[PDB]
């Protein structure tokens, strides 16, 4: 019970570790119950809409006993009012109106899906003798494309860009992720293979999925040069909207190490003193009691990119000659991680004056020999011993028990 209070005094995540903050995956996927590894997109919704084969084979699919194809042709081609074979006057009228140089374009536009028509559209030229001219703000918008800064008309139409750059919005952190993420509901028709191909073609349409992604660069080089395919013959790609930050690109949130630091008060005060100690151009030693505190401080110093090495009783006897020699010779070493009884006995630490005590309040005889590793001859400056812990906590009882032992061993 005492050591649990000691290990909530130093860092709260010694019980459970903060993990990924991701949406709940409402998905029955392919999970393993245990030279390369094949991972395939196998995500399916747990909700299944079971449909009979009779509806799909008598109402959606065309067969000999229904008129799906006949009525589809009769509605879309034979009685279409944009057909040039039967409505050439309307096609000529609309061609004069819009300036489109093809009179079959109105038939092609009306018989294509809206997303597909968005994707396949290219900026073709229009004739001047037409009634579809350019209104003034379209002109301005199309004028201010690659116009540089310090131009009046470019900056007048870059209000959102100036608000994005002025408000420092590309380094902000994402604060909201959805609670549940789910795929679309899987429709199954048991005993039919046409429905699986149709569902796979609708869900994973190659033109639509290609437009929401991009070809790799080496693949683009291969088809452009080694296969001779021209650039305009490429599939249209890269139509996915660019997100705000790198944080807003995904709904998975990694454990932020700033949140790791700020939930422990001792680590927060240690960081806020270590910044000015590093600005002073110094060298510091920190002593610990548990190996998990050493590991968490190693993970903290990886964010701080401080030149640090760790000394512990779990390490072998050979390399204890080498970290001490490097500490005494090169000055770029900054942080020395020690245990109490690992480095406090006879270790030459004359290049140290600043020793820090993270939670070492165990025994006054063993604590008092710990800065004695650094409090020795050859020291060239003022020695300051730092001792930090949290108030109104078990350490209060541990510290005045140590002070009672200090008074007992000094009186006796």
């Amino acid at each position: 019970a005492v050591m649990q209070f000691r290990k909530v005094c130093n860092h709260p995540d010694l019980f459970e570790r903060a993990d990924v903050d991701s949406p709940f995956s409402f998905t029955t996927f392919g999970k393993t119950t245990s030279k390369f590894t094949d991972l395939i997109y196998s995500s399916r919704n747990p909700i299944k809409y079971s449909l009979p084969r009779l509806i799909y084979e008598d109402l959606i699919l065309p067969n000999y006993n229904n008129d799906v194809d006949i009525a589809n042709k009769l509605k879309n081609v034979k009685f279409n009012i944009f057909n040039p074979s039967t409505n050439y006057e309307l096609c000529l009228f609309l061609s004069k109106l819009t300036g489109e140089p093809s009179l079959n374009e109105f038939f092609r536009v009306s018989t294509t899906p809206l997303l597909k028509r968005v994707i396949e559209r290219t900026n073709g030229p229009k004739n001047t003798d037409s009634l579809s001219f350019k209104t003034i703000t379209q002109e301005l918008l199309e004028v201010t494309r690659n116009a540089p800064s310090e131009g009046v008309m470019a900056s007048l139409l870059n209000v959102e860009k100036h608000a994005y750059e002025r408000e420092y919005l590309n380094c902000i952190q994402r604060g909201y992720h959805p609670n549940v993420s789910a795929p679309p509901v899987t429709i199954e028709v048991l005993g039919s293979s046409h429905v699986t191909n149709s569902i796979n073609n609708e869900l994973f349409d190659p033109l639509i999925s290609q437009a929401l992604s991009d070809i790799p660069a080496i693949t683009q080089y291969n088809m452009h040069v080694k296969k001779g395919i021209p650039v305009e013959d490429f599939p249209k790609t890269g139509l996915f909207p660019e997100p705000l930050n790198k944080n807003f690109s995904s709904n998975i949130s990694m454990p932020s190490m700033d949140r790791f630091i700020t939930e422990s008060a001792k680590l927060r005060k240690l960081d806020e003193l270590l910044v000015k100690l590093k600005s002073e151009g110094h060298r510091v030693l920190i002593y610990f009691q548990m190996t998990k505190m050493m590991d968490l401080m190693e993970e903290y110093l990886t964010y701080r990119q401080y030149n640090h090495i760790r000394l512990d009783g779990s390490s072998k006897l050979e390399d204890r000659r080498d970290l001490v020699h490097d500490w005494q010779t090169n000055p770029e070493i900054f942080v020395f991680l020690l245990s109490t009884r690992a480095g406090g006995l006879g270790i030459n630490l004359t290049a140290a004056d600043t020793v820090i005590f993270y939670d070492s309040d165990w025994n006054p005889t063993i604590d008092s020999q710990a800065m004695d590793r650094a409090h020795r001859l050859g020291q060239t400056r003022q020695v300051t011993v730092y001792r930090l812990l949290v108030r109104g906590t078990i350490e209060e009882r541990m510290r005045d028990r140590a002070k009672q032992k200090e008074q007992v061993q000094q009186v006796v």
């Binding site: 996927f29 997109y41 196998s42 449909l51 009979p52 509806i55 048991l190 699986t196």
Partner: protein
């Protein structure tokens, strides 16, 4: 299956009737209302025969006297694979659907199409999986050793089945079900092996089983509508399905019925609190009950000679006389002290609340003197008083403590009328100052 612990009508497991359509005094969680239960059994047999469509049934009576209980008994005694749409009066006032379109969708959700089809399934425990790959992976060899408790076999797999086995990773000892046509492979879990958990399948491997589907006419209406797909059954943005799709679905269902490919399963549309509809909805109900594919509509109301919505006059049950012409009315009656005591005993034994005789008598007295639902709600809130003093059985003083703690309608109305200055009136005048 689809578990939820305690509800208001969870004790009702159907109408309590014998083989001769006569109601027992206490059966299936239903006591009292013998003529109403007999009439509801007659309506249940009208639904079960399935030869008569578009009949309006009105359940009218005093509030808290066996109206929604009768509909829940009808729905529980109906059995599954028969549709039972239970909508409210205010549920049809949509912002992207008209009232007639929402009423048509609620009408057509209650007519089912019964279709039986046969399918081929391969279900068993995987012994060993052996895929041989190449460097490019274009051509692959496969060996699937699968077994049931009665059989063992080994299969040569094509490239598509090898790809469908690497996707949704199957290991040794997994129990899987394979559809040969669609290629869907479902992992049922792992077999019983220590070195989630599902029993190994028995009997044949290549099985021929019959699945039974019941698809409502609204689902075929949504699917056959080319504007929106089948996802509108879940998103709910169907958006005013045109009448030509409805006529095509009706003609195709009449085609399938004559050839024996499908069956008609009529159900019940229960419009609870039907007085909230307007005169336009009432006239659409009037002309929607004379159609072939129309369910048997049950309407419940407690209004008595009230103002019809969308009109300026007063009509019986809140419904105009032409709608009442098309309806046969079931009348529910008030309860005596023994029926109220039996309802309270059933509701107490449903919520696992142990009652003493004196507490039951006190609850019966305050049920016949205030309301039945007040005494039903007092039981669960007095059991917490019983366990707050570490006692199992609810005594009389626990019911008295719950009575003084929680007010009924009459005591609250009296306390409001005695202290009318402390509350906001119709004119918005209140006094907050306790002085003067």
């Amino acid at each position: 299956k689809s578990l939820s612990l305690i509800a208001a009508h969870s004790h009702i497991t159907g109408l309590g009737l014998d083989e001769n359509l006569q109601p027992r005094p206490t059966s299936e969680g239903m006591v009292g209302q013998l003529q109403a239960r007999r009439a509801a059994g007659v309506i249940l047999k009208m639904v079960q025969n399935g030869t008569i469509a578009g009949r309006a049934v009105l359940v009218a009576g005093p509030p808290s006297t066996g109206k929604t209980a009768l509909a829940m008994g009808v729905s529980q005694s109906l059995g599954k694979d028969v549709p039972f749409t239970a909508i409210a009066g205010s549920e049809i006032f949509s912002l992207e659907l008209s009232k007639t379109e929402a009423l048509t969708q609620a009408f057509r959700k209650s007519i089912g199409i019964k279709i039986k089809e046969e399918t081929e399934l391969i279900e068993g425990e995987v012994v060993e999986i052996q895929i041989d790959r190449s460097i490019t992976g274009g051509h692959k060899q496969g060996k699937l050793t699968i077994k049931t408790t009665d059989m063992e076999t080994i299969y040569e797999l094509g490239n598509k089945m090898i790809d469908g086995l690497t996707k949704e990773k199957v290991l040794a000892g997994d129990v899987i079900s394979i559809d040969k046509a669609s290629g869907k492979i479902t992992k049922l879990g792992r077999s019983f092996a220590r070195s989630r958990f599902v029993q190994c399948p028995e009997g044949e491997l290549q099985k021929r089983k019959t699945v039974v589907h019941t698809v409502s006419l609204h689902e075929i209406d949504v699917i056959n509508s080319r504007t929106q797909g089948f996802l509108a059954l879940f998103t709910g943005d169907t958006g005013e399905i045109r009448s030509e799709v409805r006529d095509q679905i009706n003609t195709k269902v009449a085609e399938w019925k004559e050839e024996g490919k499908a069956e008609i399963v009529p159900g019940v549309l229960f419009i609870d609190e039907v007085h909230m509809l307007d005169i336009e909805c009432f006239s659409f109900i009037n002309r929607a009950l004379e159609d072939e594919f129309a369910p048997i509509v049950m309407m419940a109301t407690n209004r008595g000679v009230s103002k019809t919505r969308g009109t300026n006059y007063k009509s019986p049950h809140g419904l105009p006389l032409d709608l009442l012409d098309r309806s046969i009315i079931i009348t529910t009656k008030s309860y005596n002290e023994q029926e109220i005591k039996t309802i309270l005993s059933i509701r107490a034994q449903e919520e696992e609340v142990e009652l003493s005789s004196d507490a039951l008598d006190l609850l019966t007295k305050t049920g016949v003197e205030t309301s039945l639902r007040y005494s039903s709600n007092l039981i669960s809130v007095a059991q917490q008083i019983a366990m707050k003093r570490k006692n199992n059985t609810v005594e009389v003083e626990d019911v008295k403590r719950a009575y003084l703690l929680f007010l009924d309608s009459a005591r609250s109305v009296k306390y409001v009328q005695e202290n009318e200055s402390q509350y906001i009136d119709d004119q918005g005048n209140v006094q907050i100052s306790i002085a003067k």
